[PDB]
């Protein structure tokens, strides 16, 4: 499916993850679990106060992700 | 209209065996290493006769340096088989020449004289693996005898089916049969061609003959 | 094709999802068919080598295949011919590629070329992954029991691991099923699987159980208890087959057995359990085709190989750090080495040309290369650097604009606008400028980058063929043709002698024949005459000369006393392998030599040069009381003498061939003080004479190249093989049965000259059962003495062994030296 | 079923927070997870994937 | 600046007009001439036949055939400061516009190293007994002033690391060097060897110079003209410098400017009918104008000539007098014809049909072709001067291929005007001889070049 | 002779006459040194005769 194939297909590629509380995390995802929980490396987190927090590794939960920004060119589907 | 046959394998294997006497010995195609059309074109082109092959009318129609004997090292003397095999090295002025030379993984065909138990526990050759080294390749996989609970209701997919079946041997045998018997469904053919004598035609060096047969 | 092009461009741009892959496997172990099947999966658009049935040339294929995760991957695959003679293409492929995949036939077991390929990969520091092709042979040909099959499988992997351990002192990696390094695949029936891959399939069919943990305990000495549930170490006396057998080989056999064995009575129900859906039409196919279809549906796309490639391949990023030290002459330090390592499309960029791919229409051919750094745009003008070109040697170098770029699917040419570094690419318009291996650089840019070391060949070319066009007036056309083949083939070495005979050097018959054929039908129209095949020889001296001739120069400003004696048993071989090479410090090198061979410390100090090649068999040594007294001048004279000595060693004093395994030693050096230009100019010619004279004084040396031969044969024909070898002066080394397969392996050696037509004779006598591969391996002194006037040579009749040396010597001289 | 008629079409997705997503509907799942192409929030998100847990309403905002 | 080995140089053993190969490797790549034995060796580096040769054959000064540089070995350095300007010039002659005017020499009597004494452009060529035809075309084209001056001072063309504005390929670089060579006022010997050019034109497929069984001055002229126009061409320097004024087969294609102008003419044929049926006109561009030659018996034995036909030779004069077009429109093919020469080119090649290779070996058309025109007043001038006897344009003979009937092949000798001494000049296999221009016609004419004056009344007035 | 007739190809012998009547071992051997001498000698003699009087 689109969540699965593009989820694990984005491993190693830069992607943006927007949490439910408004925390945006942009970076290269290391892996995507079937539970939708993902782990990103060298991800930049921007809080609601405008504070940019650069983390070497971050693990985002599946239920805590509101949406995700996939890379421009890849084919899971047309 | 009696075109397009589909065969039960059992029928096919039975017929094959009855035609077994007519059938050639060897499943592989390596036997006919020298049985090459390209070779025959080249032989005619190079005007060279292969020991026990066909001869032919000649296709169309001097001290030199390389010829000289004192400068020649001979270990082995360039036999005509080499000239035909590599006619642009062996043979000068090749024209319209194709590349004979078929090299492939060795063809091994297994058959058993007595049915025994379907399948064979050990090969006829009986080559021994006799794995030999250190601690027989220690494997550090999933935590055995610990966290490897395993999954309930799961089993190998092919376990229910038997490894071999009463017709397994026959099925395998039909993989290496002369062309009309290797297909369950094969195209219907006329009797216009003539005979199945080509295997007989293919004989290389029978021996105990008058030339009569060589011709 | 445009959508695909966009996706390909994105993948190329990423440079981490694309890993260059090169696969080499013994003749007929299925590399070519595997690639063909992969291409079919990738592009359902199905639009000399073919007739021969043997790959003669390496072909590069680029494809995008989804893995188990589903992330798209970019793979550059270069297929290398299995045949040992055409190994050179494989070496080129290995140099271009990051990692090499090894293919081994299950039934055949370890084979000649497998070993050689593994050794080359270890030397070249490329990660090695091995796929076992023709897995079905045991099941459907050998009919080995599943336990038996597992035993045979364990053996091959163990042997491969042993070879890797032997080649590299450090055991960074070992190949095992648990690691995922080795993939069990059969190319023909479209089943490619690894324990991980099989585990994934099992998980998909079943509930959701964790695949990785099951895979780890899945293969190698693990027993699964049904009552126990989770896998555990074997504790059942009753005996349940190792879990590899229980979960993999058992069901694999059962699938195959049903389809071949029944196919009507019970085959459908088995399919239901499997869940495969079959058309009635499909079930009416012949067994091989039907079996392949069934297997394809059950095994998915071709996932194991892709998984292996993504997982254990360093790819573009790691790429250069291991690669550049061997490849780049600078080896990194200040700029270029660092830049190459990053691999970004910035600054110097860079290209490396390791191949020339011929065009049918014209002599010019498209070059193939792995873009090392930055990126290349169509119509840009790029500097070309020859292997000859170094630091400040502008005359060899030439610069030309790039007409077009192509990305190569199997024998299809995708035009593209630009190519990022780390991607294989065909370059139009660089054909005239480059000979053999080449380096492409920023054109007119200051940049300055050392050329990548030229290809170093696993074999040594030995077989010499003379060529002359039938009609003299067509000579220049033939010469043109020869140029083309020099570009087309890697090791193919040509030369023009003093006589004027045009000579081609090759690796063996098949190589030579194919080269001849290719030139004749594709490069030059002209009819070509050909001399009978002859081996080169090498010259060595059996014993030291009692008296050393000392020769003055044209102007008698100096004299040189030099002796010669054959080098030690384990000296020449080490010298060449660079074990005791001239690069090392005098203290380090001398000490090493003394320790290894009980070398004198003083003699070690006295070592000057290795003669003909930077790594060469010959040694130049200075041992005089006088030299120490006036060293200043002595160093300069020694350098000039060493150049002269180098010249002398390559040419020869008998057959005008290379001198092998000889130490030359200076005992008296006479140079007039303040010699100036006199010494500088006169000494070199003199030195050449000096070398020869000592060679004349220091015994007679007999040499001939020998081939290592592997013969695979049934038990009944071993006697015939032995007889052929005995007939041709061969001698057999080892005769041993092949484990897990029926057949004997015969290893033997055979003189190069006597090897002509050996293959063919062997096959003919054994009714096409025995098969021989042959590779240059070993030099060995010929029975006949180099000089024997009392020996009378009959003009046609083959001579007896006691004086072959004379025959060879004289005839070779008559061919050119006179 | 009805999911095949909306394939390769531009729909309008509403979330639980009141945000509207207008993009080309590509693929979905049994969990109602919409993958929109060239989506525009009411900032251009472009290619994005929205969860079905916070989904509210899915309407057709224009021809495919 | 005595690099003392300069003393060892043997000018008299150089010969650049040899195939550009190492004599002991037969590679073209990085070829160096030894200046002491004049033998080619592939080179620079240690194990190169040039380096080895420099030391086993004691010959240190070399010339890099493909790059304009000299090297002194054994060290392997370049001789920066090159009194070998003499040598380099015998490789690669170089000219500035002054030189082509300069002396009005027109062809001032040069010396070679042998002190043999020959008029610069007016040089013969070795091995006429296999390339005599080729030597005739090469001397025709290298006589035509716009063509010749183009090559002689277009030094830009095909270096290694040239700019972008310059290239055209190996065929044109070599024909350029042939032309340069044949005008060289300081040739080391009197005569030149185009045998390698010719063989490269058969062997180097980008020319399929692959004509045989005829292989004449006409055929080779055509094959050359066509080739040059394809191989220098528009924007790719080969149609701007060519000169699409200097002829103009004005009908079609304008190709390399110089030889679609500069060798084509246009005959507008004009088919007519009576009644009111306005039959049709066919302009055709043509680099060489095939004259017929009336009805020579050929399958008829002889004592020929004055006892079958010579004198009235001249069935021929300006034969057609308008070709098919003016008086004798005996135009057998159809209803009415006249064949006007409607463009009239700054040269005009004529080619006499001397014979029908369609049949046997050939009894030719020997009927002598009397235009030794003798007419200028100030005459005995061979005043050639052909004026159009319906219009005026006024043209002076300036070349004249002759056939000769050697019992072995053929032969093809070539007679060139020399405006400035006013002396016709035969060359005949490295031989040269002056010829009475009124007696030219007593050979079997084959090909003439006819310059346009009165266009030099446009350029007698246009200076 | 070489200066008078120098060819890169050195075809020379291509046309060089010999006797087909004798067996190969008896018939004249072909060598550049031999063949170039042959052509040089012939050439030298040919050049002593005016074409207008006679030729060879
Ligand atoms: N048993 C078995 N044989 C196979 C399979 N795939 C290919 N072969 C056979 O192995 C032989 C060699 O296969 P190829 O792929 O053509 O060999 P290649 O590697 O492409 O060409 P070379 O490199 O010259 O060996 C052929 O005779 C094939 O029929 C397979 O899956 N199983
Ligand atoms: Mg292959």
Residue numbers in the entry:
A (entry chain e): 4 to 81
B (entry chain A): 224 to 284, 292 to 445
C (entry chain C): 112 to 158, 173 to 943
D (entry chain f): 7 to 48, 65 to 86
E (entry chain W): 103 to 565
F (entry chain A): 1113 to 1168
Task: Quote the authors verbatim.
Pre-mRNA splicing is executed by the spliceosome, which undergoes an ordered process of assembly and activation prior to catalysis. The A complex associates with the U4/U6.U5 tri-snRNP to generate the pre-B complex. The pre-B complex undergoes RNP remodeling to become the B complex, which is converted into the activated spliceosome (Bact complex).
The human pre-B complex comprises U1 snRNP, U2 snRNP, and the centrally located U4/U6.U5 tri-snRNP, which are loosely bound together to yield a highly asymmetric and dynamic assembly. The tri-snRNP has the appearance of an irregular tetrahedron, with its four corners corresponding to the U4 Sm ring, the U5 Sm ring, the U6 LSm ring, and Brr2. Neither U5 nor U6 snRNA directly engages the pre-mRNA in the pre-B complex. In the pre-B complex, the small protein Dim1 directly interacts with the tip of the U5 loop I, which remains unoccupied. In the pre-B complex, Brr2 is connected to the core of the tri-snRNP through three patches of direct interactions: between its NC and the Jab1 domain of Prp8, between its NC and the convex side of three tetratricopeptide repeats (TPR) of Prp6 (residues 272–373), and between its PWI domain and Sad1.
